[PDB]
Symmetry: D2
Subunit: 128 residues, 4 copies
């Protein structure tokens, strides 16, 4: 089974998927994020951030407040299972994480923490 | 706190929200669904269906198969916590359900079961 | 034929339609805009603004620069055929305009001028 | 200036852009379409089709009727300025066309002609 996904965030406040499936046979999983938009990261930056559903709101809320200089993530935030850096137009970044960090019966959300984006830039991540 | 939400499904494969919050002080909760599109229910029907996240895929899969005559829900499907009827252009329908049917620590999804719509017509429902 | 449309802008950077049809038999046309989101107008304000397609970019660009105090429209901007005020959570506003302001063979765009929203909050308006 | 764009259509009824700009200095322009979804072309096929805004509705309407076997385009449809083939999960296709086929003062639409998709799978194409 494939153990990676390519994700884009654009100038229209959108990721190109709202649902990621990680096959239970994967040992690692890689997200390759790119920004095919034209706007710079100070006005339209995106990241890809994974947390439990229960933790999403706190990660987004604390992240928003940290500013462009912290990639809109609270420093030393243990709620963050895995994440990319914040990118703007023409940039890309990849994150690989150990699938053993995910459990069944738990449900996960991915999202961007740039101010206000998560209302549309969010989706589910699930083992199967 | 408010204990109802107005939801629309349109001709563009979209609900007008992807996240519903039910205040923990509500005893009942009402969803008022409408279809401001122009297309009829045989080609662009929508419903609003609530289940646990774990049950969503089975409800959608079994529902799809039941046809326009069953409102695209498997008969006697106990996985369905609450739902509206399937509606087309110009129609509306409301459902009220007991908030005691929802628990904390559990996470819920709403979605439309008309064939293929749930890939975009879906969102989270959470107590708070 | 109907000569009005109800439009919503939400917390997810979206209008609930991307295509408005004005029947050629209408003498006036009314847009009723509402904001069913929770965010205030300083962070998630929306308006509904009509212009020719050729004029859209200049209206959006000049509008962005005018600030919350000008409802993000350049004062005395003759390019604006019709528009609502800028609204935030829980507010609504209606605009009525004369259909004789529109021509056939010309093509029109509607959009929100709040900073950056028009990349997703836009659509076509056409006589038929 | 760049004279190509990469476009995706997914399982969620979406292209990853709603606005294409063709630089006036381009002599040719290339669209590279891919389908990163999982669904096959009989249920979730996509193409990329360019026409004038005035011609869009007729191309979509006549195209819909032609069936999977005709890639949902009416044979010998002179309204089609350029187009890709219809693709499903895991497929890709590119089209190159002469920029001299486009004029200023005219306004263009791109869209998918698979049944009903164009309500969301559409956008503008403009010279600049
Ligand atoms: Cl979701
Ligand atoms: Cl458009
Ligand atoms: Cu494998
Ligand atoms: Cu973002
Ligand atoms: Cu109350
Ligand atoms: Cu539906
Ligand atoms: Cu009338
Ligand atoms: Cu807006
Ligand atoms: Cu060049
Ligand atoms: Cu399509």
């Amino acid at each position: 089974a494939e153990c990676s996904v390519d994700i884009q965030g654009n100038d229209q406040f959108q990721f190109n998927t709202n649902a990621i499936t990680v096959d239970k046979s994967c040992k690692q999983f890689t997200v390759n994020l790119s920004h095919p938009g034209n706007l710079p990261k100070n006005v339209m930056g995106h990241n890809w951030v994974l947390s439990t559903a229960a933790d999403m709101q706190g990660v987004v809320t604390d992240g928003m407040a940290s500013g462009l200089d912290k990639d809109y993530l609270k420093p030393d935030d243990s709620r963050v299972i895995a994440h990319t850096k914040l990118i703007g137009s023409g940039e890309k970044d990849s994150v690989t994480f150990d699938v053993s960090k995910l459990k069944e019966g738990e449900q996960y959300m991915f999202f961007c923490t740039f101010p206000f984006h998560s209302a549309l830039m969010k989706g589910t991540l699930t083992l199967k």
